[PDB]
Amino acid sequence: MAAVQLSELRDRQAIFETLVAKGRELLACDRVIVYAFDDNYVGTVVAESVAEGWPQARDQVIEDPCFREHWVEAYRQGRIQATTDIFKAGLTECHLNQLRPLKVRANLVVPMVIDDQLFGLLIAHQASEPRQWQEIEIDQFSELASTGSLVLERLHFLEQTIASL
Numbered sequence: 430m431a432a433v434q435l436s437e438l439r440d441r442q443a444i445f446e447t448l449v450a451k452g453r454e455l456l457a458c459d460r461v462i463v464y465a466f467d468d469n470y471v472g473t474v475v476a477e478s479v480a481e482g483w484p485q486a487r488d489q490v491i492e493d494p495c496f497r498e499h500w501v502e503a504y505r506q507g508r509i510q511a512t513t514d515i516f517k518a519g520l521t522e523c524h525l526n527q528l529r530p531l532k533v534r535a536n537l538v539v540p541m542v543i544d545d546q547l548f549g550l551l552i553a554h555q556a557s558e559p560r561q562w563q564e565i566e567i568d569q570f571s572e573l574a575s576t577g578s579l580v581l582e583r584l585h586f587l588e589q590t591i592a593s594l
């Protein structure tokens with residue numbers, strides 16, 4: 430086919446593991462889910478990490494046209510939402526029944542914007558019990574997640590961006 434080996438390109442699935450691997454390791458979280466955004470405002474769980482006893486996803490599509498719909502522009506500004514006890518935020522119906530089965534007890538959304546575009550979003554959840562992510566923990570999330578954007582940014586464009594370098 431081609432004289433070019435895949436070795437020239439790294440597995441997109443691997444780079445993801447680093448973000449989720451560190452997030453749960455460095456922060457010592459129970460469960461954390463990460464999915465890339467699509468053109469239909471629908472996410473895609475390309476990588477997920479959950480402790481033993483919890484439900485694993487991966488290859489699942491997140492369809493929640495609530496925040497990703499309106500809060501979108503808000504995320505572009507780098508807005509975040511921190512809810513320790515989801516029982517105080519989201520007195521909805523399907524939502525509660527949607528998380529119940531997941532035993533999700535938390536709410537941390539960190540906006541990921543590449544080239545000024547919402548490519549993905551990092552969400553952490555404490556399956557065990559509610560938790561409060563300190564402002565410092567958010568800062569780390571930004572740098573941790575931000576680093577990922579750089580990876581995808583490179584693969585996105587590199588063949589010809591700045592010859593002068």
Ligand SMILES: *[C@H](c1[nH]c(/C=C2\NC(=O)C(CC)=C2C)c(C)c1CCC(=O)O)c1[nH]c(C[C@H]2NC(=O)C(C)=C2[C@@H](*)C)c(C)c1CCC(=O)O
Binds near residue numbers: 493518527
């Ligand atoms: C807003 C809303 N949806 C989501 C999506 C998720 N949170 C999760 O933990 C998970 C997977 C484990 C998903 C997926 C978030 C984070 C938010 C915002 C948080 C908030 O402050 O409310 C939202 N969802 C619903 C229920 C309904 N809407 C949907 O998109 C789907 C799908 C539903 C069930 C069929 C509601 C009522 C809201 C709040 C509306 C608003 O304030 O704009």
